[PDB]
Amino acid sequence: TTGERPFSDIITSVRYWVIHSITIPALFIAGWLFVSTGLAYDVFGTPRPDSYYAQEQRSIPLVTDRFEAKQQVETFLEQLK
Amino acid sequence: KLPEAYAIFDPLVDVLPVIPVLFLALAFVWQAAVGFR
Amino acid sequence: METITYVFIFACIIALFFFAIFFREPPRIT
Amino acid sequence: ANLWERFCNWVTSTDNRLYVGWFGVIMIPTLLAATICFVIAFIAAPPVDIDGIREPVSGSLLYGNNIITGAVVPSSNAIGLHFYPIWEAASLDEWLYNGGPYQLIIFHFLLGASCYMGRQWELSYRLGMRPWICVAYSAPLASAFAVFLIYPIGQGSFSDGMPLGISGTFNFMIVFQAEHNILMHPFHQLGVAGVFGGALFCAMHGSLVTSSLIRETTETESANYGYKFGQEEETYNIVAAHGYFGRLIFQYASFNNSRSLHFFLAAWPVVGVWFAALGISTMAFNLNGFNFNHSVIDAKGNVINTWADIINRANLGMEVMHERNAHNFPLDLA
Amino acid sequence: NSIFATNRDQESSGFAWWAGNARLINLSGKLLGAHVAHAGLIVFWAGAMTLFELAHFIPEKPMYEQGLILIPHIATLGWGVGPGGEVVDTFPFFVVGVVHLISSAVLGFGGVYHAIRGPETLEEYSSFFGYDWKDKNKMTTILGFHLIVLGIGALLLVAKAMFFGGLYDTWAPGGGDVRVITNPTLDPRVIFGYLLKSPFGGEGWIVSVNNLEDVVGGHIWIGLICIAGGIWHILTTPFGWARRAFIWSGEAYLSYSLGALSMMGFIATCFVWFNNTVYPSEFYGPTGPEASQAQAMTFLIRDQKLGANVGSAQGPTGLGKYLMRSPTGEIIFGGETMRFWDFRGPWLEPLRGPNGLDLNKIKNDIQPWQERRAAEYMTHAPLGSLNSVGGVATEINSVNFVSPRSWLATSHFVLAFFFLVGHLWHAGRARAAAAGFEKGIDRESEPVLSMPSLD
Amino acid sequence: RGWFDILDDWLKRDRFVFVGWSGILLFPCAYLALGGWLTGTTFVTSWYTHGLASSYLEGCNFLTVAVSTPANSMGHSLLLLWGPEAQGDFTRWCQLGGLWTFIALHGAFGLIGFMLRQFEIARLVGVRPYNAIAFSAPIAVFVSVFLIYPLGQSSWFFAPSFGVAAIFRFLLFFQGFHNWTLNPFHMMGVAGVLGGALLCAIHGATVENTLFQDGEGASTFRAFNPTQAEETYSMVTANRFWSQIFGIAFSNKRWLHFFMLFVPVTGLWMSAIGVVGLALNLRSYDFISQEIRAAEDPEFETFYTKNLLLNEGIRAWMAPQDQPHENFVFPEEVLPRGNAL
Amino acid sequence: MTILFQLALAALVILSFVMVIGVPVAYASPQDWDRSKQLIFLGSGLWIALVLVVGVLNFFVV
Amino acid sequence: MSEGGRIPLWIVATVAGMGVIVIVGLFFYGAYAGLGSSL
Amino acid sequence: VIAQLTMIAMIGIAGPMIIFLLAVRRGNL
Numbered sequence A: 001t002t003g004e005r006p007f008s009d010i011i012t013s014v015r016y017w018v019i020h021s022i023t024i025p026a027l028f029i030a031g032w033l034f035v036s037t038g039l040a041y042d043v044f045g046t047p048r049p050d051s052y053y054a055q056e057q058r059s060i061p062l063v064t065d066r067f068e069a070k071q072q073v074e075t076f077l078e079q080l081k
Numbered sequence B: 001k002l003p004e005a006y007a008i009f010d011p012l013v014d015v016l017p018v019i020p021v022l023f024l025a026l027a028f029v030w031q032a033a034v035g036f037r
Numbered sequence C: 001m002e003t004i005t006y007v008f009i010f011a012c013i014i015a016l017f018f019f020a021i022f023f024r025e026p027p028r029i030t
Numbered sequence D: 001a002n003l004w005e006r007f008c009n010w011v012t013s014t015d016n017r018l019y020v021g022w023f024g025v026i027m028i029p030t031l032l033a034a035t036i037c038f039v040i041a042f043i044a045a046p047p048v049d050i051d052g053i054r055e056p057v058s059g060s061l062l063y064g065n066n067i068i069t070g071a072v073v074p075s076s077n078a079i080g081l082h083f084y085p086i087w088e089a090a091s092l093d094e095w096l097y098n099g100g101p102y103q104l105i106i107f108h109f110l111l112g113a114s115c116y117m118g119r120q121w122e123l124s125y126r127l128g129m130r131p132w133i134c135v136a137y138s139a140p141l142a143s144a145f146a147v148f149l150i151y152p153i154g155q156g157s158f159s160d161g162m163p164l165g166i167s168g169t170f171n172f173m174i175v176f177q178a179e180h181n182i183l184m185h186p187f188h189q190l191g192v193a194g195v196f197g198g199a200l201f202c203a204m205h206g207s208l209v210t211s212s213l214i215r216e217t218t219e220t221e222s223a224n225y226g227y228k229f230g231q232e233e234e235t236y237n238i239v240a241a242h243g244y245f246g247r248l249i250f251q252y253a254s255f256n257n258s259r260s261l262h263f264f265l266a267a268w269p270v271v272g273v274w275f276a277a278l279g280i281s282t283m284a285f286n287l288n289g290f291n292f293n294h295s296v297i298d299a300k301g302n303v304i305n306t307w308a309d310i311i312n313r314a315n316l317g318m319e320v321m322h323e324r325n326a327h328n329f330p331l332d333l334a
Numbered sequence E: 001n002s003i004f005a006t007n008r009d010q011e012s013s014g015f016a017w018w019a020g021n022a023r024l025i026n027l028s029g030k031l032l033g034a035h036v037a038h039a040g041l042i043v044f045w046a047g048a049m050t051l052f053e054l055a056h057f058i059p060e061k062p063m064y065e066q067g068l069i070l071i072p073h074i075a076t077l078g079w080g081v082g083p084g085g086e087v088v089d090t091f092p093f094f095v096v097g098v099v100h101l102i103s104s105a106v107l108g109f110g111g112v113y114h115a116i117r118g119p120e121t122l123e124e125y126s127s128f129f130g131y132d133w134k135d136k137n138k139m140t141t142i143l144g145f146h147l148i149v150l151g152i153g154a155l156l157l158v159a160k161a162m163f164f165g166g167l168y169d170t171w172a173p174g175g176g177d178v179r180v181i182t183n184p185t186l187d188p189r190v191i192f193g194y195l196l197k198s199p200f201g202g203e204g205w206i207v208s209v210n211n212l213e214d215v216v217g218g219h220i221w222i223g224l225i226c227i228a229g230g231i232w233h234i235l236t237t238p239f240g241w242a243r244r245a246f247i248w249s250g251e252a253y254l255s256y257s258l259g260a261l262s263m264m265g266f267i268a269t270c271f272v273w274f275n276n277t278v279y280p281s282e283f284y285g286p287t288g289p290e291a292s293q294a295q296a297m298t299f300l301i302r303d304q305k306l307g308a309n310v311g312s313a314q315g316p317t318g319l320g321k322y323l324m325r326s327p328t329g330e331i332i333f334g335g336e337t338m339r340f341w342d343f344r345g346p347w348l349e350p351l352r353g354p355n356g357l358d359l360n361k362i363k364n365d366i367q368p369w370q371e372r373r374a375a376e377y378m379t380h381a382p383l384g385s386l387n388s389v390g391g392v393a394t395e396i397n398s399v400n401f402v403s404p405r406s407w408l409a410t411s412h413f414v415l416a417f418f419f420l421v422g423h424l425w426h427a428g429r430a431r432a433a434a435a436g437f438e439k440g441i442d443r444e445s446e447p448v449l450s451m452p453s454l455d
Numbered sequence F: 001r002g003w004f005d006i007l008d009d010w011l012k013r014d015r016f017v018f019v020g021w022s023g024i025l026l027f028p029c030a031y032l033a034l035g036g037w038l039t040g041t042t043f044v045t046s047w048y049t050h051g052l053a054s055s056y057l058e059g060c061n062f063l064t065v066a067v068s069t070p071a072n073s074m075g076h077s078l079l080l081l082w083g084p085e086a087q088g089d090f091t092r093w094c095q096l097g098g099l100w101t102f103i104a105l106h107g108a109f110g111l112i113g114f115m116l117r118q119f120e121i122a123r124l125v126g127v128r129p130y131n132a133i134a135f136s137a138p139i140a141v142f143v144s145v146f147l148i149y150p151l152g153q154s155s156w157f158f159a160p161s162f163g164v165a166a167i168f169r170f171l172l173f174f175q176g177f178h179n180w181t182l183n184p185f186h187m188m189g190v191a192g193v194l195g196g197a198l199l200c201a202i203h204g205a206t207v208e209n210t211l212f213q214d215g216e217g218a219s220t221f222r223a224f225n226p227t228q229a230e231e232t233y234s235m236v237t238a239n240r241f242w243s244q245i246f247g248i249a250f251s252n253k254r255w256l257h258f259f260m261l262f263v264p265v266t267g268l269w270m271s272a273i274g275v276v277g278l279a280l281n282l283r284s285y286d287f288i289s290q291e292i293r294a295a296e297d298p299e300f301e302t303f304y305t306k307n308l309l310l311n312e313g314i315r316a317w318m319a320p321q322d323q324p325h326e327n328f329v330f331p332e333e334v335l336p337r338g339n340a341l
Numbered sequence G: 001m002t003i004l005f006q007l008a009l010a011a012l013v014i015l016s017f018v019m020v021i022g023v024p025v026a027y028a029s030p031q032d033w034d035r036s037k038q039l040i041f042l043g044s045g046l047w048i049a050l051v052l053v054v055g056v057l058n059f060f061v062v
Numbered sequence H: 001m002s003e004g005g006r007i008p009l010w011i012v013a014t015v016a017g018m019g020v021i022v023i024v025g026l027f028f029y030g031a032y033a034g035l036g037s038s039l
Numbered sequence I: 001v002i003a004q005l006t007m008i009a010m011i012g013i014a015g016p017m018i019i020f021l022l023a024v025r026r027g028n029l
């Protein structure tokens, strides 16, 4: 034995499921809303389906300058009207 | 398509072929309920 | 001479198989 | 005890330096024929019209190859799956031009190796052992059947069987990727998990047993002298080994039962390689790897490439270049 | 009261839960249960899957465009189809599905009953239904019953073909159609002549059967052989040479059947891959060979329309671009499809003459329907991805297609292989158990220790 | 007495999850590398660095998601979050490929942490540290492939990207540009890996099929006891079997297990050396004698020249989309292609 | 007539679910085997009858 | 009550496994609809 | 697609329901 109480005693315990029948659905719904509200896009800078290209543009917004790469990305995003 | 009369059962039909798989899975529920003795 | 070399090395390897099997140090139980 | 009785006794004898056995009565001649023909062909065979387009490919050492480039070249696409023994040719020269050696060698080899598996069963029975070593061996054997027999059957020609040579093997792999996207096939992936995993567990078991050898030697001798062949006592501390491994991960990912441990050691690579073999054997009937070419599309309808599409570009390169003189029609349907 | 109180545990049986069905070896009643319930699962799947197929079936679309494997089987028997394999009536499909599904209820009932309610062993209950695996007489009797049952089945196929509507004949004069078979091939030279054919190219062993008369006659022969055989085994017991040749145990019998079924699975794989007679391409799609040939046909047709003289067109390699000779001289299609010249099909055969493809027929007699069919087959070649993206591995997403021949061939190769493994497993184990060392080496009597050193 | 000794005491307690001094390095870096990969493959794009979608959020699946390498223009920038490229902006940092160096570096130091764990636990339990030593091969592979190799090339861009399909692309690229299959160091690698798998299988099967009967059960697993003195299988019978089947056999158990360490470990080390070569494009690409003969003689053909044609196909057809920073435009007429295809 | 057919078939489906759950349970249950037995006979007869009824009614709507 | 065993482990396993099946199934549905579907 | 999920839920619960029911009334599991 390592000193802690066995997992099979915990996941069959009523207390455990009391706690986790709350905390697990809450976390799940939270991630759900992280996506469904669109926040994920803006946190990670991921294009929405309408945001890979400006309407008539057909060239990838490839970063080509190391030290003004930040500026170059901002410029590309600006070019999406 | 099924004959028109039977059409209301289309969803049931869509699920029926998967049931034999369930038996395999059931074998493990049962065994779990007797401690894999 | 390249061909002779390849065939030579291969032939030596087969010879080694022969010795390693038939002239191994015999396993002995203590 | 007549002659047949004595013969059977000698064939099945547990005292022969190499076990013969009934599977061995077939194995020995077929494997000798395959080997002899292979060595001679690899050294001296003239070039072979593999793709049936009168474009002979040189495989042997005397005709300009080294060890890495050499091969016994698959039989001609004009032959397809037709049986082409020596006596079907008008001459040995014809036979060589059309890749007869390949057929002789792979058929004798497959027979011989099947009998090799059988033989593992047989000797296990004569020695009073449990019988399943041969089942372990069925995995590499099934793989050989896949690349030498089944894939040619599915594609309709031994000209698409794996060549008997190093670069030829690579050729086979590349064209295979072009035509089946085998890297994106879950069975090949299971195969990789099988051999990566087998290598991992090999190193792991090796190092753990090595790490808990009981001290039986001095510093100036090999620790291996600490074990005597046939000794009754285990030579290492399996409790120590387990105690290390459980702490390294957590206590329960570890095997304290040596039997279960060794069973896992057998089962992981054997099952993974079974699936690799089934990968080649089902891609034989062109049920290919996952295809996600142009799977991601934006709101307008522009294709947004994924790494799957880059893989597709590479595959396209392979496809358009392979067997550059062999296709007259736009689709490579086999 | 106790969790070890029954015989359904390792403590009583000697077997772990993961080998739990091995606990049934000598429990004939419960084993009867297992078998009958499993038969239930098989019949269940037949019925349910047929109904699923039918519900998803657009009858004017090609079956093979629709992921169907059972309806092709029913249609091959002549039910529901007309000339060219058009669906004229789906109700037979429905009947087959429903009846299988209702039957599975009965099998399931008897299975569950025998498995958990009826006598756990049959021997005390009935000498007829009881059995000892070691009793060669009783075993051969049961083998006989089942042989008779199989013979009856083959004869059912024959009766369908001869007295109840016939079968779908892809080779029927004027185009594929349902035809009654009135002159089955009874000549043994032909029937067993098939059995002695090479499995290799242009021969193809029994997979080369290419007309319904041979099929039907073959099933007459197999039915009679099986009924006779069954009678034989009911009335006899294995001879000495047999007794000394085999291992006599349930596990051994099981291993033998696993070998048999493995072999049969591989055979089936090749049948559905190459044969377009009992797997009509109308229902299953073209074979690989067939589609390849069909591409050559398609472009021969296009270029000849444009003005090409396809007999004399030299390709880049020196071989003919469209037409060339096989290694024995027959005129065959050019390009890579040179490998597939053994192919035969009702759309191509009218172009065939004594020396192979006939240049004059090609120039003058190719009908529109032939062009249609060649184009269709060329564009439904059995190539496709695991996620059912049709075409070569580099094709873009657009077509949802994997040929039924690919699904059936691959599935049954996998199954046949693992059943070969199962054969080695249970054969080796049966030998070791009969000999008494399947649980390991006796420390006090280790055989190798009483053998002379190898060296 | 003495905070250091107290701390050492606590770190080395025998808890369910051993911590140790090594854990101070291992746990944060491993957690950050794994978390980085899950975060990236779930939420992050490769649009600005590769012109690729690469996350579940964009519609990729498990096979096609990846945390991709930075853009070629970034060179071998450490691309730290507070560095001169991202300048502390997390979003731009993700868009510029910062998660790639995040995961590669935290991963490196994590591997260091883990091997240190192997040493520390070996030392506390009292066994020889062979497990650590063997772990040197994963290290050599990671360091040569994910660090040395791109450091030799133009930038992190040509490093492997962290994803299933991305890694497949890495394989195909190495075939097309490096002819990596021809490299004797890769071959030694392959021999070590497949030979390792072989040893794993054959050893496992052999032990399981020369077991002594040590109980009455038909399931033989129960008939073992960790503290038993006796070998559970017959080395003598195993040796006879393999001697008669294969001609040779192990007879020394210690040598057997050391050899099981030696083969895959040595193999991975050799492959690492080959990759270090490839960092410099120091390839086993050609056989010069082959090329002189083929150049002069249009009828001379081998599997080696066939494979070079395949490679040329790969380079030409994949380079424009795989190397977007080069702005390759290859008109249809210059694409190498065989007849019809 | 169509809703009649749909009713007999729905009856067969219901009775079927009921058998599928209740028959193994009865079979493996300690108490009340005589009662359960009579009810399994009843369910079986009614099931067969309903299959035949749906079978017959089929040809008055299809 | 932290009492270990109040819920039968076989039921927990069954429910949990069914949950996994549901979620993976949802992902596979996702491969055929919306983003990633090729349509 | 509501009826499909509902049906596979009923059917899907039928098996574990049989196991549970028997386990409760201490039947011959």
Ligand code: CLA
Pocket (backbone or CB within 6 Å): B024, B027, B028, B030, B031, E007, E008, E009, E016, E017, E018, E019, E020, E021, E023, E024, E027, E030, E031, E033, E034, E035, E037, E038, E041, E105, E108, E109, E112, E115, E116, G019, G020, G021, G023, G024, G028, I018, I019, I022, I028, I029
């Ligand atoms: C085709 C699949 C299949 C079949 C037909 C069987 C059949 C059997 N198994 Mg095996 N088994 C299987 C797969 C199968 N098994 C798998 C996959 C495993 C690994 C998990 C096992 C592991 C295993 C072990 C360890 C044991 C068995 C045993 C048995 C036998 C007795 C079971 C029993 O009494 O439990 C009682 C179960 C119940 C009372 C629960 C209900 C059971 C019924 C049959 C369910 C019916 C459901 C169905 C929908 C109802 C339809 C009704 C309608 C038609 C009217 C029985 C013949 C036992 C044995 O050998 O007995 C001596 C045994 O000890 N099995």
Ligand code: CLA
Pocket (backbone or CB within 6 Å): B017, B018, B019, B021, D271, E049, E052, E053, E056, E066, E067, E068, E069, E386, E388, E404, E407, E408, E411, E412, E414, E418
């Ligand atoms: C002979 C067996 C067989 C074959 C050839 C087919 C073929 C087909 N089925 Mg069918 N079906 C089967 C059995 C079979 N099925 C079974 C058992 C079920 C119940 C689950 C179904 C229920 C079913 C439905 C509901 C549907 C199909 C559909 C289809 C079509 C598309 C298949 C697909 O996309 O799969 C995708 C590929 C996979 C899922 C890969 C499976 C990989 C397996 C798990 C590997 C297993 C190998 C081996 C057994 C493992 C051994 C383990 C080892 C350790 C020992 C295709 C024609 C579809 C269709 O188009 O209908 C019109 C469809 O909707 N099938």
Ligand code: CLA
Pocket (backbone or CB within 6 Å): E032, E036, E106, E107, E109, E110, E111, E113, E114, E118, E119, E122, E125, E126, E129
């Ligand atoms: C599949 C093979 C099979 C075998 C070998 C048995 C054998 C037995 N059953 Mg079981 N049983 C089965 C399937 C089988 N059953 C099925 C499918 C069901 C569901 C209907 C049952 C339901 C059942 C019950 C409720 C009982 C038995 C009983 C028995 C025992 C006495 C039977 C007897 O003598 O009847 C005498 C035989 C006849 C009166 C003639 C039978 C004619 C049959 C019904 C028609 C044959 C036509 C054709 C060949 C069928 C082909 C089916 C195929 C297409 C699938 C005997 C051990 C009894 C028992 O175990 O008591 C302790 C018992 O009470 N069986």
Ligand code: CLA
Pocket (backbone or CB within 6 Å): E140, E143, E147, E195, E196, E225, E226, E227, E228, E229, E230, E232, E233, E236, E237, E238, E239, E242, E245
């Ligand atoms: C499932 C079907 C089945 C099974 C399991 C059996 C089983 C048996 N039969 Mg029976 N038999 C059957 C059907 C079956 N039979 C039928 C339908 C008939 C009527 C033709 C017979 C007529 C029959 C007779 C006359 C005899 C048997 C005998 C036996 C016993 C020994 C057989 C043996 O040694 O085979 C092993 C096979 C051999 C030893 C011969 C070797 C043949 C070569 C080596 C195999 C070549 C196969 C080839 C690779 C693949 C096929 C293609 C090929 C044709 C080109 C065994 C119990 C014997 C017995 O004991 O009777 C009491 C016996 O004398 N059977």
Ligand code: CLA
Pocket (backbone or CB within 6 Å): F024, F025, F028, F029, F032, F078, F079, F080, F081, F082, F098, F101, F102, F103, F105, F106, F109
């Ligand atoms: C111990 C675990 C550990 C280790 C080894 C690392 C290592 C790293 N991290 Mg990670 N990280 C960690 C935990 C760790 N991290 C944790 C817990 C978090 C969440 C808070 C992060 C979140 C994180 C982010 C967001 C980033 C990193 C990054 C990095 C990389 C650059 C770090 C750097 O430049 O530090 C520089 C600072 C130090 C090394 C501190 C040294 C302090 C010195 C020793 C004090 C000297 C005192 C002196 C002797 C006194 C003399 C007195 C005299 C003056 C009189 C590096 C590989 C960057 C990266 O990966 O870029 C791609 C990055 O962007 N980390």
Ligand SMILES: CC1=C(/C=C/C(C)=C/C=C/C(C)=C/C=C/C=C(C)/C=C/C=C(C)/C=C/C2=C(C)CCCC2(C)C)C(C)(C)CCC1
Pocket (backbone or CB within 6 Å): B006, B009, B012, B023, B024, B026, B027, B030, E033, E034, E037, E038, E040, E041, E044, E051, E098, E101, E102, E104, E105, E107, E108, E109, E111, E112, E115, G012, G013, G016, G020, G054
């Ligand atoms: C022994 C055993 C086992 C097994 C079992 C089994 C396998 C069973 C089977 C069973 C079965 C196999 C069953 C079946 C049933 C069926 C049914 C119940 C059906 C019904 C039907 C119906 C109801 C129909 C309907 C309809 C119509 C008529 C028309 C159309 C539409 C519809 C579809 C609706 C297990 C594994 C669990 C384990 C333990 C032991």
Ligand SMILES: CC1=C(/C=C/C(C)=C/C=C/C(C)=C/C=C/C=C(C)/C=C/C=C(C)/C=C/C2=C(C)CCCC2(C)C)C(C)(C)CCC1
Pocket (backbone or CB within 6 Å): E190, E191, E192, E194, E195, E206, E209, E214, E215, E216, E217, E218, E219, E221, E222, E245
């Ligand atoms: C239906 C049909 C037909 C016909 C068919 C037939 C007529 C068949 C027959 C078949 C047969 C007639 C078969 C047989 C087989 C056999 C076998 C398969 C055998 C085996 C054997 C074995 C396995 C053995 C073994 C051994 C040895 C070798 C040694 C000793 C020991 C032992 C015994 C183990 C045709 C094609 C026309 C057409 C189509 C349909």
Ligand SMILES: CC1=C(/C=C/C(C)=C/C=C/C(C)=C/C=C/C=C(C)/C=C/C=C(C)/C=C/C2=C(C)CCCC2(C)C)C(C)(C)CCC1
Pocket (backbone or CB within 6 Å): F031, F032, F034, F035, F036, F038, F039, H020, H024
């Ligand atoms: C990056 C970064 C960071 C970090 C973060 C983290 C740490 C995260 C974590 C994260 C995580 C930690 C996540 C997780 C995830 C998970 C998942 C997503 C899972 C999934 C799963 C699944 C899907 C499953 C599957 C499977 C398998 C695997 C086998 C069995 C069967 C099945 C199918 C169930 C910081 C803040 C420092 C800073 C900034 C940067």
Ligand SMILES: CC1=C(/C=C/C(C)=C/C=C/C(C)=C/C=C/C=C(C)/C=C/C=C(C)/C=C/C2=C(C)CCCC2(C)C)C(C)(C)CCC1
Pocket (backbone or CB within 6 Å): B012, B016, B019, B022, B023, B025, B026, B028, B029, B032, G013, G014, G016, G017, G018, G020, H010, H013, H014, H015, H016, H017, H018, I011, I012, I013, I014, I015, I016
């Ligand atoms: C035809 C028909 C019918 C029939 C039905 C049936 C026949 C059913 C059955 C069903 C069944 C037969 C079900 C079953 C199910 C099962 C399940 C749902 C299971 C699951 C499982 C799991 C989830 C597992 C888990 C686990 C354990 C327990 C332990 C180990 C680990 C694991 C996780 C694996 C009806 C009546 C509807 C009517 C209409 C028609």
Ligand code: OEX
Pocket (backbone or CB within 6 Å): D051, D077, D155, D159, D160, D175, D179, D322, D323, D326, D332, D333, D334, E336
């Ligand atoms: O021969 Mn060898 O490789 Ca199987 O695809 Mn077709 O053919 Mn050829 O091309 Mn791609």
Ligand SMILES: [Ca+2]
Pocket (backbone or CB within 6 Å): E004, E005, E006, E007, E008, E009, E011, E012
């Ligand atoms: Ca008991």
Ligand SMILES: [Ca+2]
Pocket (backbone or CB within 6 Å): E136, E137, E138, E139, E140, E141, E142, E233, E234, E235, E236, E237
């Ligand atoms: Ca008899």
Ligand SMILES: [Cl-]
Pocket (backbone or CB within 6 Å): D171, D175, D321, D322, D323, F306
């Ligand atoms: Cl090529």
Ligand SMILES: [Cl-]
Pocket (backbone or CB within 6 Å): D326, D327, D328, D329, E334, E335, E336, E337
């Ligand atoms: Cl072509």
Ligand SMILES: [Mg+2]
Pocket (backbone or CB within 6 Å): F059, H029, H030, H031, H032, H033, H034, H035, H036, H037
């Ligand atoms: Mg989606």
